[PDB]
Swiss-Prot record, chains A, B:
Belongs to the glycosyl hydrolase 1 family. Homodimer. It seems that the absence of a catalytic proton donor in plant myrosinases is not impairing the hydrolysis of glucosinolates. The gene is TGG1. One of its GO terms (cellular component) is apoplast. Keywords: Abscisic acid signaling pathway, Disulfide bond, Glycoprotein, Glycosidase, Hydrolase, Metal-binding, Plant defense, Signal, Vacuole, Zinc. It is an enzyme of class 3 (hydrolase). Expressed in guard cells, phloem-associated cells and myrosin cells. Its EC number is 3.2.1.147, 3.2.1.21. This is Myrosinase 1. It comes from Arabidopsis thaliana. Glycans are attached at N13, N88, N155, N216, N336, N359, N473, N492.
Amino acid sequence: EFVCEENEPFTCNQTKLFNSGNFEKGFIFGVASSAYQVEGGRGRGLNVWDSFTHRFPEKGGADLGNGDTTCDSYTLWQKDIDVMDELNSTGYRFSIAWSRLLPKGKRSRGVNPGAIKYYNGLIDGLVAKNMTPFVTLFHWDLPQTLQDEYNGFLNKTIVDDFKDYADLCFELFGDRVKNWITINQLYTVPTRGYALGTDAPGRCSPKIDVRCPGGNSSTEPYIVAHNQLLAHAAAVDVYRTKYKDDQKGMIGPVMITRWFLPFDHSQESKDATERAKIFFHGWFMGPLTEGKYPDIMREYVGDRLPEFSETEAALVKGSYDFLGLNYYVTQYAQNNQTIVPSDVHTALMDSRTTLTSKNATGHAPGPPFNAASYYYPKGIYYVMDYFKTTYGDPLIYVTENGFSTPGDEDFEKATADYKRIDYLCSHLCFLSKVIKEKNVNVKGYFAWSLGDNYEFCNGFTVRFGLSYVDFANITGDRDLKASGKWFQKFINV
Amino acid sequence: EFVCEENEPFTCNQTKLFNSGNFEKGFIFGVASSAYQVEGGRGRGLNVWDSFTHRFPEKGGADLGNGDTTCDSYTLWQKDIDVMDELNSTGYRFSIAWSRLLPKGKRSRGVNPGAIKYYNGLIDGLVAKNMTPFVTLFHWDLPQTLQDEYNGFLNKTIVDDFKDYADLCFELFGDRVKNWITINQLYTVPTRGYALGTDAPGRCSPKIDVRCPGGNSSTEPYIVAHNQLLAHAAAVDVYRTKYKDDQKGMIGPVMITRWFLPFDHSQESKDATERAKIFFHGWFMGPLTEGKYPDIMREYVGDRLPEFSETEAALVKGSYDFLGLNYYVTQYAQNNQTIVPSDVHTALMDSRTTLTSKNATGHAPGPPFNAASYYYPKGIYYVMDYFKTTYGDPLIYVTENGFSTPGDEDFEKATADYKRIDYLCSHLCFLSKVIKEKNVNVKGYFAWSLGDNYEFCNGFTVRFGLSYVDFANITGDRDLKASGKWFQKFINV
Ligand SMILES: *[C@@H]1O[C@H](CO)[C@@H](O[C@@H]2O[C@H](CO)[C@@H](O)[C@H](O)[C@H]2NC(C)=O)[C@H](O)[C@H]1NC(C)=O
Ligand SMILES: *[C@@H]1O[C@H](CO)[C@@H](O)[C@H](O)[C@H]1NC(C)=O
Ligand SMILES: *[C@@H]1O[C@H](CO)[C@@H](O)[C@H](O)[C@H]1NC(C)=O
Ligand SMILES: *[C@@H]1O[C@H](CO)[C@@H](O)[C@H](O)[C@H]1NC(C)=O
Ligand SMILES: *[C@@H]1O[C@H](CO)[C@@H](O)[C@H](O)[C@H]1NC(C)=O
Ligand SMILES: *[C@@H]1O[C@H](CO)[C@@H](O)[C@H](O)[C@H]1NC(C)=O
Ligand SMILES: *[C@@H]1O[C@H](CO)[C@@H](O)[C@H](O)[C@H]1NC(C)=O
Ligand SMILES: *[C@@H]1O[C@H](CO)[C@@H](O)[C@H](O)[C@H]1NC(C)=O
Ligand SMILES: *[C@@H]1O[C@H](CO)[C@@H](O)[C@H](O)[C@H]1NC(C)=O
Ligand SMILES: *[C@@H]1O[C@H](CO)[C@@H](O)[C@H](O)[C@H]1NC(C)=O
Ligand SMILES: *[C@@H]1O[C@H](CO)[C@@H](O)[C@H](O)[C@H]1NC(C)=O
Ligand SMILES: *[C@@H]1O[C@H](CO)[C@@H](O)[C@H](O)[C@H]1NC(C)=O
Ligand SMILES: *[C@@H]1O[C@H](CO)[C@@H](O)[C@H](O)[C@H]1NC(C)=O
Ligand SMILES: *[C@@H]1O[C@H](CO)[C@@H](O)[C@H](O)[C@H]1NC(C)=O
Ligand SMILES: *[C@@H]1O[C@H](CO)[C@@H](O)[C@H](O)[C@H]1NC(C)=O
Ligand SMILES: *[C@@H]1O[C@H](CO)[C@@H](O)[C@H](O)[C@H]1NC(C)=O
Ligand SMILES: [Ca+2]
């Protein structure tokens, strides 16, 4: 029995006391990436994130970076496998770019054969290395023409287009791909893309930001999330009834997870802490389980929250085989019953709560994570436990988990990412405890990311990768950082 | 009387004997640019050239450059006026970006107010500086969603969308803008964008280039050019019936002009030289004057050449008030009746001619222009005379004329662009001769370009501007090259 440390110093970076043997045999220790962050613009059509970044370069990052060239994994895909081979990664999570397979958006307008060859090459390369291909259908890279036609997910037309795109993917790669993920972080797009206007497509209220071409921020996020659920339900419907019969695989969505703590020792904070969990996670888990949003959210939002039809409710309910939970940090929750003017009101205010980084006394829950948050290693223990106890204990994979490091660090400092090692071992340490003590059904962990790449809304100012990628010499060998070496030795027996 | 020199050395760089007084008083000596090459990606939607450059970086230039930032005239628009003020330029030619005023392509989908403020600022700045606003409605920057919906100009739908977009421009800027241009270089888009696949949208035959997503190099160019005439006629139709009554302005198209010489002293070359002029110029000038395609083109192309309807023929005929001629170089023409396989045949081969840089004896017609051609100063004299005699009422504006300089030249070499001075004075020299001797109705000349910018299909490998723009320091002062100083002294007499 090992005592996991919650604050510095950390002894989990020693493989003598912390190794893969602390987890059950067959645990998936892997890495992850996103299509827009690695692939690039070559051989693919323009998507919504291209338009958002090009029109508002600051919104895509302070460095004004974009997903045009990044590390060019579309051309250097073999290099990613080489890094994984050195990492002994048994699995890998990547995204299929909709604007690559369907540059014109719709399947009827044509399919890019070069896209199929590229993805087949990567999948076959993983199979030759005996790596499990975790595939994300949608990673926020919606084709641009779809947004210019029916505003993307704001219209229900996207459900049919997403169905056809998913239907084509199963026919091409379903023979080898067995882990299908529909959408990554369902909560992110309606909140940061349709309420705050900080992500693509950039819709927000005029008072929230004049740069937004338009938006309401009080009705659009609920509409977009409602149509996303219908599209996600339709994709699961197609896969099980046509491809699961022969390919024998599972399909499941991925949710963003955060742990919540009371701001102080008051009952109002305790209710606000519970409300934060319900609104942040139950907003989708409720429909995923009972086919309807939580009653408290339904009461609070009222008519601004749409409702699923009888046909839709059956499809949405139980529309998952596994859950790709992603946990990064823990935040404190407090009560905020302040009435807000309509011009600046956002859907995030409907919970009547305020999320903070520090406690009432200014104490952090853990070591610093980024410029404006701190990571709480025990938070992942709570998140897995919360999902297991609140919902019928499902098959859970840690599809995304990582630590941000400043990009201005030189090669020696970036490779010596001992802080990244501390983040990963500690979170894995509490992950092992919750699997053992609480019997939580967690079988896979994917560190984010495989290598340094473009970060949404931040450009290249920070790095999440386990392997350093000198963007001045992207064709050069991508050496593994000290965190990468530790992860391989952690896997190695 | 000055003896115009056709080859080196050139004595036309002395304003003492060759100045603006050689032209009639009120002659417009100005500069020109295009939206995609100067404006940038900020505050505008994605167009077809964005997709072309992003998907095929090599096709957009060896340097892989694109129109994302270039000289950033959207942010530094005052700098362009300052350079023109230093040049004593009496006029200026610019383009209104369709993806800027209408980022979604269709007028019903919304109008960008920030675009209106930007264009009004430039127009108002020009008026305060006594600058003549020459506006090009379309400079090949078609909105991407329009191409992704109805294949751009390949469909007749483009006529209605272009009509509404042109109508909006007259309503906003027609109070001050009096020189409206519908399309720039009508011949270029069907040939280099739908036959060779070298320009946007990149449609070409599979054998011509596998990189092209698809196209027929023998049928698509004639269809696209047919719809351009319908779109061009519609834009003129709107201006005359609604705005010409009160605004009192002129609207006219712009065509690319080349002079042709026999390859050798044979009759077959002489026949081919006459055919080259008909196919290069008469393809549109014929319908613009007589309402029908040239008879020789109709016989040669046959069914692959479309025909105008009775309603369309009346609208297309006489759908111009002036003609913006652009002349750069002269090419030799020879006969070539070689039958080509259909899979590799291009529409350019329908003339049964071959265009060469040198004649049969290997002699160049003039001093070198670029890496693979030479400029013939007397060619502009022939073009004005040929257009005047073949097409009565020859109201002619020289909308584009310039000399390219290699980008690898350092700051000192680029500023000392005496080769550009030699090109400009000599072409202007023959321009004065044809105005007097041949009595051609030429009133304006626009040198290309105002400053160094992105070059289509070439990136930033070459420079056409009269003022040096250090692209590492785009916000820095844009000093005038020796050609810019000469041009000001040419006017300042
Ligand atoms: C006409 O062209 C000649 C040839 O370039 C110019 O003479 C150059 O002047 C610059 C600056 O005075 C010198 O650096 C060059 O060395 C000169 N050329 C040569 C070959 O020595 C002349 O200044 C130009 N004059 C006008 C009025 O444009
Ligand atoms: C663990 O971290 C400490 C922190 O400085 C470092 O010195 C040590 O080399 C690391 N060991 C391993 C095995 O990662
Ligand atoms: C595991 O990592 C080692 C370290 O380089 C490598 O040699 C080996 O090939 C890897 N094994 C697999 C199956 O990729
Ligand atoms: C959804 O699709 C079609 C597209 O033309 C349109 O008629 C309908 O009004 C759209 N609805 C919304 C809310 O945009
Ligand atoms: C401050 O944080 C600590 C742990 O980080 C927590 O125990 C304490 O309750 C917080 N302060 C208040 C007033 O709740
Ligand atoms: C409570 O909400 C209001 C408006 O939503 C906001 O201005 C205020 O800062 C919030 N309270 C705290 C402590 O952040
Ligand atoms: C959002 O829509 C509602 C419709 O009830 C309206 O009352 C509100 O003013 C809108 N928001 C903004 C910022 O206009
Ligand atoms: C870039 O990487 C390549 C790898 O093959 C190497 O040969 C080259 O020296 C590197 N150049 C620089 C400037 O780091
Ligand atoms: C452990 O590492 C060795 C190389 O040191 C490698 O050959 C072996 O395959 C690794 N173990 C597994 C299970 O891949
Ligand atoms: C002509 O250019 C010169 C630059 O030397 C400038 O000072 C002058 O004001 C200009 N004349 C105009 C714009 O009438
Ligand atoms: C445009 O082309 C498409 C076929 O891909 C179709 O919607 C339509 O028939 C065309 N437009 C018109 C006006 O016919
Ligand atoms: C080729 O051109 C040169 C000058 O440009 C001329 O002297 C020569 O006679 C020409 N030869 C032909 C047309 O065969
Ligand atoms: C004549 O045309 C054919 C096909 O376009 C080409 O292969 C041949 O080189 C041409 N002849 C000359 C002399 O260029
Ligand atoms: C182009 O179209 C013609 C007739 O429509 C056909 O004969 C030819 O094969 C086509 N070219 C290609 C490359 O398909
Ligand atoms: C950029 O240009 C400005 C003005 O020309 C100048 O003051 C500055 O020193 C330049 N900086 C660099 C790094 O070239
Ligand atoms: C010559 O330059 C001066 C500079 O102020 C300018 O005012 C004038 O308009 C220019 N043209 C003539 C013909 O003087
Ligand atoms: Ca770009």
